[PDB]
Amino acid sequence: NRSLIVTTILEEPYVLFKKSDKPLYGNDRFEGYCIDLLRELSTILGFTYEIRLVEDGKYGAQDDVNGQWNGMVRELIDHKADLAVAPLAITYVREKVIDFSKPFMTLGISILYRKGTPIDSADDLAKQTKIEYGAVEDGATMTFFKKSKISTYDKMWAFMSSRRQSVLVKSNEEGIQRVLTSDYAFLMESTTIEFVTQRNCNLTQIGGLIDSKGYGVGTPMGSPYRDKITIAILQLQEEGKLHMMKEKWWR
Amino acid sequence: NRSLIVTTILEEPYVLFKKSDKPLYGNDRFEGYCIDLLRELSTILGFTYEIRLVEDGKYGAQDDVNGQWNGMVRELIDHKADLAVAPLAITYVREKVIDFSKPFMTLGISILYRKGTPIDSADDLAKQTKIEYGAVEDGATMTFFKKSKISTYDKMWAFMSSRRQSVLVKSNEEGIQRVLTSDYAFLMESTTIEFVTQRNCNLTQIGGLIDSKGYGVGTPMGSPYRDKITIAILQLQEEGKLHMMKEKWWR
Ligand SMILES: N[C@@H](CCC(=O)O)C(=O)O
Ligand SMILES: N[C@@H](CCC(=O)O)C(=O)O
C-alpha cells in the first residue's frame, strides 16, 4: 500500500510549518488542528501519507471563462492528491465535482473589522462605498457572494468585483493585515475570526453569521476513502476528540 | 414623567431574582445581562422604570385558532408595558405587530443534547422517531419550525406538533432537565446553549446554527422610544460595553 498524497494549505491554526532547532522531516514538518486530524485518520483507517501544499496556493473556485476549477478542488479532480485535509468548506458547487466526508467542524461567514466603530452589520457596509471590504480570492466566501441572490450580498459582490484586484486577497492573513492598516472590513469564516480576535484586542466580529456550513475532508469523486473517513470523523466527534482538538489549537 | 413599565421574563443569565441575606426592593430585586442593559438605557435616555414579569410566562406567539398573540409581545400590543427588555428574538412575524430596536446580541437556533452519542445534526434527529425532541412552547424557535418550508424542518415540526404536550416545554430550564433525564434533544438558541454547556460538562451543541437572528428591545408599534433605544444600544455596542456585559454574565 503506497502512501497517500494529502493536499492542504497554510492557514493558522489548522496547518502551519512546525518550528524547531533540529532539522524536521516528513510529516513532522507540519502541525495544527488538521495535521492532528490527519494523523488520527491514518491510524484509525490504516494508511501512511505525505503532506503536499496546494501548488497554486488556492482553496478552489470555478473560472468564469473556461469553467475550470483551481486550488485543492482541482488537484483532487485531476487525481494529484488522494485527500484534501484542510479548512475546506463543503459547498453545493464543489460537491458537483469532488466528494466530501461529513463535517468535522461547523461555521459561518461573518465580518472582521476594528472595534469602536459604528459598523454593526453587513447592511452597514453595503450602504456605503467609503469603507472597502473583500474576501479571499478563489475561496468559498467569495463564491458565496458571487452567487448570492440576496439584494444586500448581491450589491456587495458588485462592489467587490468592480475593485477585485484592490479588495480580494490571497489569504486570510493578508485580509487581517488589510483590516489593521486601512479602512477595510474583511468577510471571513467565523472559526478563523474567533482565533484572530482572541489574539488581537483591536479586532472584533461584526454582526452574526451570514450563512451556515461545515469543513470536510475532500476526496476525488468516487473515492473509496470518503465513506471510510466519515466513519473515522464521526467516531472522533462522538468520543470528544474533535472538541479536545479545537480547544488545543484555539485555546 | 411617570416611570416606564418594563416587561421581561425569567431566563438565566439575562434575568434572574437577586439573592441577598437582607430584603431587596424595587429594581434591585433583579439582576442579569438584560437587567444591566436596562439600567444603562435608563441613564443614557433619562427615564425611571419598574420591572414586571410577563404574567402568562410566555415570550410570544400567535394562536392557531383566533390569531391573537400572547406573552411579552401581547403585553406590548395591549400597552401593559412600555418596553420589553429580555432575550426577545427579532422576527418577521413579530415585526408585524410590535417594533424592535436594532439587535443587542446575535445568535441562531441550534441543538442541545448529551455528548457521546452518534447524533451529529438536525438530520440525524429528523431521520428517526425514537429520540424525542422539542422546543419552548410559544417562542421564536417553535414558530420557526411551524413556519419552515425546508423539508427537514417541516418533518421535525410534524413530529413536535403530533406530540406537542409531551415534547414542547414551558421554559429553557425545563428543556435542559428533559435532556439530562431522558432520551431527548432540545432545540434552543445558541447563546443560551453556550451558557448551559459551560456549566454542564455532560452536554453539548449538536451541529451548527439552523438560522441567524438577533435579540432586541421590543416596544408597542409606533413608540417614540424605539429609535432612542436603538441609538443607546449602538453606543453601548461601539464602546464595547455590550461585549463586557456578555463576558460578565457568561464567563
Ligand atoms: N475556507 C474557505 C476559504 C476561505 C474563505 O473563503 O473565507 C474555502 O474552503 O474556500
Ligand atoms: N428567545 C425566544 C424564546 C426561546 C426559544 O424560542 O428558543 C423568543 O424570543 O421567543
Q: Is the dihedral of CA A97, A188, A194, B87 positive or negative?
A: negative
Give the SS3 label for residue A209. coil
Query: How far apart, in whole angstroms, are the C-alpha atoms of residue B205 and residue B194?
Result: 8
Query: How far apart, in whole angstroms, are the C-alpha atoms of residue A158 and residue B184?
Result: 46
Cell numbers representing residue A177 in the block: 493585515
Cβ atoms < 10 Å from Cβ of A227: 13
Looking at 3.40.50.720, 3.40.190.10, 3.30.1740.10, 1.10.10.60, the CATH number of the domain A1-107+213-251 comes to 3.40.190.10
Give the SS3 label for residue A68. coil
| d(CA A12, nearest CA chain B) in Å | 21
Q: Closest ligand 1 atom, CA of A109? A: 7
Which helix H or strand E contains B32, and what residues bound it?
Answer: none
Helices vs strands, H then E, count in chain A: 11, 13
Backbone φ, ψ for residue A94 (5° rounding): -70, -35
Neighbour order of strands in the sheet with A184-189: A132-134, A184-189, A109-114, A203-206
- State the virtual CA torsion across B209, B215, B218, B224 in degrees, nearest 10: -120
| Residue having the nearest C-alpha atom to atom 4 of ligand 1 | A139
Report which of B179, B178, B189, B142 is spatially closest to residue B161, judged by C-alpha positions.
Answer: B142
The CB-side HSE value for A19 (13 A sphere, CA atoms) comes to 0
Query: How far apart, in whole angstroms, are the C-alpha atoms of residue B38 and residue B50?
Result: 10
Q: Which positions in chain A touch B210 (Cβ < 8 Å)? A: 212
Domains A1-107+213-251 and A108-212 share a fold: yes
Q: Check A117 against B238: CB less than 8 A apart.
A: yes
Q: Is the dihedral of CA B138, B140, B145, B146 positive or negative?
A: positive
Query: How far apart, in whole angstroms, are the C-alpha atoms of residue B126 and residue B152?
Result: 6
Bridge partners of A16, per DSSP, are A31
Query: How far apart, in whole angstroms, are the C-alpha atoms of residue A198 and residue A79?
Result: 38
Q: Do the annotations mark residue A141 as ligand-binding?
A: yes
Q: Please, which residues have CB within 8 angstroms of residue B130's CB and are 6 or more apart in sequence?
A: B183
Contact in structure between A232 and A49 (CB atoms under 8 Å): no
Experimental structure resolution, Å: 1.8
Q: Is the dihedral of CA A79, A82, A85, A88 positive or negative?
A: positive
List ligand 1's pocket residues with C-beta within 6 A.
Answer: A 59, 87-89, 135-136, 139-141, 188-189
Which helix H or strand E contains A129, and what residues bound it?
Answer: none
Q: Do the annotations mark residue A194 as ligand-binding?
A: no
| d(CA A41, nearest CA chain B) in Å | 18
The per-residue DSSP string of A51-103 comes to: EEE-TT-----B-TTT--B-HHHHHHHTTS-SEE-SS-B--HHHHTTEEE-S-
Query: How far apart, in whole angstroms, are the C-alpha atoms of residue B137 and residue B33?
Result: 23
Cβ B175 under 6 angstroms from ligand 2: no
Cβ atoms < 10 Å from Cβ of B166: 12
Query: How far apart, in whole angstroms, are the C-alpha atoms of residue B191 and residue B141?
Result: 13
CA distances from A93 to A69, A129, A140, A163, B225 (A): 11, 30, 10, 24, 46
**Does the domain made of A108-212 have the CATH classification 3.40.190.10?**
yes
The per-residue DSSP string of B87-135 comes to: S-B--HHHHTTEEE-S-SEEE-EEEEEESSSS--SHHHHHT-SSSEEE-
Query: How far apart, in whole angstroms, are the C-alpha atoms of residue A10 and residue A30?
Result: 10
Q: How far is CA B59 from the centre of its chain?
A: 7
Report which of B28, B8, B9 is spatially closest to residue B18, judged by C-alpha positions.
Answer: B28
Bridge pairing between strands A203-206 and A109-114 = antiparallel
Query: How far apart, in whole angstroms, are the C-alpha atoms of residue B217 and residue B195?
Result: 21
Cβ atoms < 10 Å from Cβ of A133: 25
Query: How far apart, in whole angstroms, are the C-alpha atoms of residue A75 and residue A220?
Result: 9
Contact residues, chain A to chain B, C-beta under 8 Å = 102, 106-108, 115-118, 120, 204, 207-210, 212-214, 234, 237-240, 243
Q: Which positions in chain B touch A214 (Cβ < 8 Å)? A: 208
Which of A102, A209, A240 shows the shortest C-beta gap to B115?
A240
Cell numbers representing residue A188 in the block: 471571513
Q: How far is CA B183 from the centre of its chain?
A: 24
Contact residues, chain B to chain A, C-beta under 8 Å = 102, 106-108, 115-118, 120, 204, 207-210, 212-214, 234, 237-240, 243
Contact in structure between A86 and A15 (CB atoms under 8 Å): yes
Q: What share of chain A is helix, strand, coil (3-state, %, to 5)?
A: 40, 20, 40
Counting ligands in written order, which one lies closest to the CA of residue B15?
2
Enumerate the domain spans of chain B.
1-107+213-251, 108-212
The per-residue DSSP string of A8-49 comes to: E--BTTTBEEPP-SS---GGGGEESHHHHHHHHHHHHHT--E
Query: How far apart, in whole angstroms, are the C-alpha atoms of residue A39 and residue A26?
Result: 13
For chain A, the straight-line distance linking the first and the last C-alpha, in angstroms and rounded, comes to: 37
For chain B, the C-alpha Rg in angstroms (whole number) is 18
The CB-side HSE value for A68 (13 A sphere, CA atoms) comes to 8
Method: X-ray
Report which of A80, A4, A16, A72 is spatially closest to residue A42, judged by C-alpha positions.
Answer: A4
Task: Name all contacts of A64-67 with Cβ < 8 Å and 24+ positions apart.
Answer: none
Give the SS3 label for residue B44. helix
The CB-side HSE value for A180 (13 A sphere, CA atoms) comes to 13
CA distances from A6 to A53, A86, A116 (A): 8, 10, 42
CA distances from B110 to A95, A144, A159, B141, B251 (A): 24, 22, 33, 9, 21
Q: Do the annotations mark residue A94 as ligand-binding?
A: yes
CB pairs under 8 A between A and B: 51
Contact in structure between B220 and B4 (CB atoms under 8 Å): no
| d(CA B18, nearest CA chain A) in Å | 31
